[PDB]
């Protein structure tokens, strides 16, 4: 008779992951349609799982989370997703729940890693002329 739905975002370098968190009969978290048991490197499936794991499996009990990520390559789409999920739980508890039940589970996220919630502001620094990269200059020879 109602629709409880929350959209959050996460950004790491260029990966923008939009997590649509809604209430369902079953927990079902899938990143770009892959059901998070099937995110392929076991290393990067564990960074997306610790959005769920540092807070508890009980808090994602009947929540269907859809994470749609674009941009930014393989590793940056894990930190974009795990932030979109961890922000997605909290913005589902900003509405629909009181402040006492939140802000314990906000601080469980903040105590573990600061980048479950805020952002990593680091972007690529531009290449400049006379330099192969942002910083490395052309080779001087003297003779």
């Amino acid at each position: 008779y109602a629709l409880k739905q929350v959209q959050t975002f996460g950004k790491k370098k260029t990966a923008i992951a939009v997590a649509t968190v809604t209430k369902a009969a079953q927990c079902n978290i899938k990143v770009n349609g892959v059901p998070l048991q099937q995110i392929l490197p076991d290393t990067l499936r564990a960074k997306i799982m610790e959005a769920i794991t540092v807070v508890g499996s009980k808090y994602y009990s009947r929540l269907r989370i859809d994470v749609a990520v674009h941009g930014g390559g393989q590793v940056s789409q894990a930190y974009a997703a795990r932030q979109a999920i961890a922000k997605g739980l909290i913005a589902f508890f900003q509405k629909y729940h009181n402040e006492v039940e939140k802000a314990a589970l906000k601080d469980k996220f903040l105590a573990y890693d600061k980048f479950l919630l805020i952002a990593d502001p680091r972007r690529c620094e531009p290449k400049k002329w006379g330099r192969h990269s942002a910083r490395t200059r052309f080779t001087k020879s003297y003779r």
Binding site: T43, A46, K47, M49, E50, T53, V75, Y79, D113, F115, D120, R122
Partner: peptide, 9 residues
Amino acid sequence: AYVPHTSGR
């Protein structure tokens, strides 16, 4: 940690 990789500064 759940893995060595963390990407922190």
